[PDB]
Design a protein around this ligand. Structure first.
Ligand SMILES: O=c1[nH]c2sccc2c2ccccc12
Ligand SMILES: [Zn+2]
Length: 208
């Protein structure tokens, strides 16, 4: 039921999605090990993901969270990188996209920093890098990230350096407490609390 609509680079929606992608790049404490060395991306394509059933699944759950949290969905747009982005756009998020070894438990992880999600495109810790060259820092191969609408609801705040949400909460917020430049990361425990709105195809760019 999924169709992908290609956005024109002249569309304001293309532009605002690209800007969120580029502006949320940061340096990482692994010196680029997982995700490569780059300060910015070459955005190749931005597609709107359209699936009525997956959307209504999202909005149904959003209303439930909202009504449990004084009419506040606490909805964000967050990045998600994963080897399984193609399963995700067709079938939605579910238990199989949970990070079992994650620091906030076995849920589905999202990032404010596009560059954080980039580290997961080829697997946990970047896996063995790109299929074709085995290069975690490949500048040639095309990568994809999802920019997702996520319902956080009442989020459990965890300061720091499929399971269930903490009792009385709808998500976990991993608040960075050491690296002053890191943005927040988030975990939901229900696949229906995220909708993969944009598929972004890109390459990381070698600095000069
Ligand atoms: O964007 C992310 N994708 C994936 S896939 C398995 C774990 C994660 C992950 C963890 C922390 C922050 C972002 C992400
Ligand atoms: Zn490659």
């Amino acid at each position: 039921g999924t169709i992908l609509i290609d956005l024109s680079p002249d569309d304001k929606e293309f532009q605002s999605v690209e800007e969120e992608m580029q502006s949320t790049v940061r340096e990482h404490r692994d010196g680029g090990h997982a995700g490569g060395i780059f300060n910015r991306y070459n955005i190749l394509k931005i597609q709107k993901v359209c699936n009525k059933k997956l959307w209504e699944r999202y909005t149904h759950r959003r209303k439930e969270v909202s009504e449990e949290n004084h009419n506040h969905a606490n909805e964000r747009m967050l990045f998600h990188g994963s080897p399984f982005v193609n399963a995700i756009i067709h079938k939605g998020f579910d238990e199989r996209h949970a990070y079992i070894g994650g620091m906030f438990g076995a849920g589905i992880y999202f990032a404010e920093n596009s560059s954080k999600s980039n580290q997961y495109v080829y697997g946990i810790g970047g896996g063995t890098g790109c299929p074709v060259h085995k290069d975690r820092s490949c500048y040639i191969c095309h990568r994809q990230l999802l920019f997702c609408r996520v319902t956080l609801g009442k989020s459990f705040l965890q300061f720091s350096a499929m399971a269930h949400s903490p009792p009385g909460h709808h998500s976990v917020t991993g608040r960075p407490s050491v690296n002053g430049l890191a943005l927040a990361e988030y975990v939901i425990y229900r696949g229906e609390q995220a909708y993969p709105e944009y598929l972004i195809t890109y390459q990381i760019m070698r600095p000069e």
